[PDB]
């Protein structure tokens, strides 16, 4: 597993000058401040407990917090549902925001970047449209 601080530092390298990122978090999953402080990227967490909360909570990340990307950390329950994943990817993409995701299943559906212990995995077509260049050293 790639830890959250390792993930956020990788996001910082892919999106230099990102200032605010939104996390959609499954309230019922098992188990960011040091990550946020170590990177200087504000992390806004919107928690969801069921599918019907995903749309309202996502739209609050955008309306109230002006986030520049979506970050999903795990998929053990609600965020493992196809409907939640498809909603988040489609609406983040419509809003012009890349999605940093926990597995490659997300990338096949249009998320931008995931990771594995650390190697990066990139949906090249999405990263290019989003203006994301993978560092040469990676």
Residue numbers in the entry: 27 to 57, 65 to 150, 155 to 175
Recite the paper's sentences:
Substrate-binding proteins (SBPs) are key structural elements of the ABC transporter system that determine the substrate specificity and high affinity of the ABC uptake system. A typical SBP consists of two α/β domains, which are connected by a hinge region. To understand their molecular functions, we performed a crystallographic study of single domain SBP from Rhodothermus marinus (RmSBP). The overall structure of RmSBP showed the single α/β fold, which is identical with that previous reported, although the molecular flexibility was distinct.
The crystal of RmSBP soaked with NaBr (RmSBP-Br) belongs to the orthorhombic P212121 space group with unit cell parameters a = 92.84, b = 97.86, and c = 101.98 Å, containing one RmSBP molecule per asymmetric unit. The crystal structure of RmSBP-Br showed the three disordered regions at the α2-helix (Arg58–Gln64), the loop between β5-and β6-strands (Asp151–Gly154), and the C-terminus (Gln176–Leu182). These three disordered regions were shown to have relative flexibility in the previous crystal structure analysis, but were clearly disordered in RmSBP-Br. Although NaBr was used for soaking, no electron density map corresponding to a Br ion was observed, and it is possible that NaBr had diffused in the solvent regions in crystal packing, increasing the flexibility of the three disordered regions. This indicates that these regions of RmSBP are likely to be dynamic in a tentatively solution state. However, the position of three disordered regions of RmSBP was not directly related to the previously predicted substrate-binding site of RmSBP. Therefore, these regions may be involved in interactions with potential partner molecules or receptor proteins. The sequences of the disordered α2-helix (Arg58–Gln64), loop between the β5-and β6-strands (Asp151–Gly154), and C-terminus (Gln176–Leu182) in RmSBP-Br are similar to those of RpSBP and potentially have a similar molecular flexibility.
